[PDB]
Amino acid sequence: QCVNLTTRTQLPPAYTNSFTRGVYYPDKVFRSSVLHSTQDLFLPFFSNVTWFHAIHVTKRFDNPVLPFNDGVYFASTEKSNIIRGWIFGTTLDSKTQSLLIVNNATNVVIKVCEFQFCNDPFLGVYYHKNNKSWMESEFRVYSSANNCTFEYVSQPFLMDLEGKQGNFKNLREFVFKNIDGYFKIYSKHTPINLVRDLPQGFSALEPLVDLPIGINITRFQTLLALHRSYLTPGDSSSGWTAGAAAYYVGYLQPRTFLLKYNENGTITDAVDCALDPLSETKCTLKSFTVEKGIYQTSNFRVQPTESIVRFPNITNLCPFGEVFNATRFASVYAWNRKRISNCVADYSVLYNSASFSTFKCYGVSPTKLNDLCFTNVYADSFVIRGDEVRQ
Amino acid sequence: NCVADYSVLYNSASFSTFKCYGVSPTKLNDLCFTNVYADSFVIRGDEVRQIAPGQTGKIADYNYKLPDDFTGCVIAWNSNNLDSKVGGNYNYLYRLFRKSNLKPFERDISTEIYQAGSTPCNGVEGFNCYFPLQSYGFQPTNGVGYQPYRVVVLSFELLHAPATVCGPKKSTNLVKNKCVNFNFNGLTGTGVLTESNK
C-alpha cells in the first residue's frame, strides 16, 4: 500500500528577521486622503521568518509538517516549480477532506477531495530526450480518490511562465484563513530583484479566492517536486534529486494597528500603533507628527492573576448522618416526621453511593446539584421491594 | 451574481416566522445584499426553536447555528408525503453526543467515539463505543408535529450594498447630471452627479 522512505539525518531549523510585511485593507472599500485605524488579523511591524534549506543532492533532506494554528502566512520565490501544492488534514487520510492545488502551463486545477496519502508523498517528473521537455508520469502521490465535492479549473492569471531563466526575480504571496467555514487564498505578485533576502517592499494583497470549507484542522504539509535522474545500476547513488528553494513560515494573531490612505487610495506610510511610545502617542492623535509636550495614552492597568474561593467547611455538620447515618430507617409502617432545616444539606452521600436509581428527574445538572438551600430534607421512613419503581 | 427573485417566497403557504429581518423597513426586492448562502437541511422538525435567536437546541448543539447575527431567512415548509419511505426513512440520519455548543459555522465529518465512559473504540466496536451516527428512520404514520420537515436558512450578512446578487425587473437609463436620488446596485442616496476620473 505505502512505502516508507525516510532519512535518519535531521538538522535544526534556522531563524531570520522579517521587515514590514503582512498588511491588507480591512474592508473591500476604497478611501482617499483620510486616516483610519483598523483592528483585525494582521502581521506586526517586526517579527521573524522561518525558511528551510530544501536542497538535497551542501545537502539537507527536510520534509516536515506544519500545524495549521488558524491560518499560515506564506511567501515563495520559486523558479523551477518547486512548491506544487499543499495537503491539509489533521490525519492526512481518506477519512478527511484535503486540498489539492496543482499549477501548470495550460490550466490551474484546484481540487478538494479525499485523496489517500502515503507516509512520504512526493511528486516526480521525467525528461524525455526525444521531446526535449518535462512531463509528469509518476502519479503515485495518491492511492485512492473518493468523495469528490469541489473541482475548479481556470487559466493562469498572475503567473507568466515566460522567462526561461529567472534568478529569484518574482514574488508570489499567499494568505490563509480558516474562519466561518472558509479557506480564503489571496494572490499577490510584485517583481522584486535585490541583494538581501528580504527587501523593504510594502504592498497589500488583493482578494481573488473565497472558497469555503468547514473542518477542524491543526496540521498540514507542503508538497514538492522531483526531477528524475538517469542512474546506472552500479552507480549506487542517494536516489533523491531536488532544486533550490525556500518558504517563509509564520502565524496569525489579532491585534490593532493604524493605516493612512493616499490620494491614490493605497496606504503609503503607516505607523504601528502598538510598537513604542513615540508611535503609541499617535494612536490617539490623528497626525504622524507631534510637537513637544505631554500626551496621555491608554491607562496602565494590572490584571489580577489569582482567582480562588474560600467556602465554609463545617457550618452544620452532616445533615443526614447525625441520626440516620448514611442510610438506615425504621419499619415501613411508621412514617415518623423528621426534617432537618437551616443546615448544610450537602449531597456528599449520593456522589459515590452504590447502584440505586434516584427520582429520575435531576432537573439542574444531574448528580452535580448541591446549589440550593431547600426548605427541609424530611425523609420519611419506609421500605419497599423496589422492583416496581415505576409504581 | 444572479437575480435572487425573492417574490417566489410569498407563494405557497405554511413556512414559519421569518424572525430575522434586522435591517430596516420599506421594500423587499430592491437591495442587492452581499452573499446568498443556502444551507438547506432536513431535521425531525419537532422543535425549530434552536434556529431562533438564543434558545440553543439539541440539534443546533452539534449542527447549524447562528451565533448572534442571523438576519436571514428560516423558511421551513412542512412536508411528509415527499421523500418518505413506506418502510421507514432510513436515508436521513443525524450525529449525536458531539461536545457542547460547538462553533456555529463549522461542520465536521468524523465518527471515532466520544469516549463518554472509560474505554475508547481503539478502532473496534464495544460498549459505549458507538459511532455518532443514528438513523432517523422516519415513519410515514408517525405523528404530525414529529414528521420530518424541510428547512433552509440564509446567511445574508449585509455589509456591502453594491453587490451582484439582485434581480429587480425595473430598468432605467443612467443619468449624467441631475439632482435626483439614485438606487444603483441597491445603494440609496441623494445628491447631484458629476463625472470625473479616479
Epitope: - | 449525536l96 463518554a116 465512559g117 460498549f127 443514528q134 438513523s135
Partner: nanobody, 117 residues
Framework: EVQLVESGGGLVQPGGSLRLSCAAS????????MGWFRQAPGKEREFVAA????????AYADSVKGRFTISADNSKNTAYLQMNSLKPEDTAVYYC??????????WGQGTLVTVSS
C-alpha cells in the same frame, strides 16, 4: 451490586430461534453501555453487541451479523434479543451487563443456552 435476571435459555435444535429477556430493575436511568456478553467453554469472555439507551444505535460483532438483532424498551426497562442460525459452537452461556454512571458492567448470572440435536 445491581440485580440482573436472565431466563428462557435451554436446549434448542440447531438453527433455532430464542427470545431471552433481561429485566433490569432500575439502573440509575443513565445507561450508555447496554450490551450482552458470552463465555464459551474454555474460551475467554468477548464482546458481542451493545444497544444505546439514548438512541437506536445497535453495534454488532462480526460473528453475529444479520443473525443477531437486539432491542430494548425505554418504557419497560428491559433488553430483548432474537437469534437465528444456531450452530453447535454457539453452545455457551450469555450475560447482559448494565454499564452506567459509576456502575461498571453490572454483571449478573446469565443463563445456559444449549445448541445440540
Amino acid at each position: 451490586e445491581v440485580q440482573l435476571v436472565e431466563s428462557g435459555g435451554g436446549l434448542v435444535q440447531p438453527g433455532g430461534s430464542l427470545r431471552l429477556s433481561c429485566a433490569a430493575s432500575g439502573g440509575t436511568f443513565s445507561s450508555i453501555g447496554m450490551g450482552w456478553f458470552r463465555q464459551a467453554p474454555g474460551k475467554e469472555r468477548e464482546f458481542v453487541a451493545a444497544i444505546s439507551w439514548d438512541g437506536g444505535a445497535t453495534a454488532y460483532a462480526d460473528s453475529v451479523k444479520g443473525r443477531f438483532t437486539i432491542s430494548a424498551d425505554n418504557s419497560k426497562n428491559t433488553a430483548y434479543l432474537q437469534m437465528n442460525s444456531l450452530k453447535p459452537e454457539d453452545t455457551a452461556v450469555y450475560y447482559c451487563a448494565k454499564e452506567d454512571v459509576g456502575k461498571p458492567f453490572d454483571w449478573g448470572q446469565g443463563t445456559l443456552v444449549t445448541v445440540s440435536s
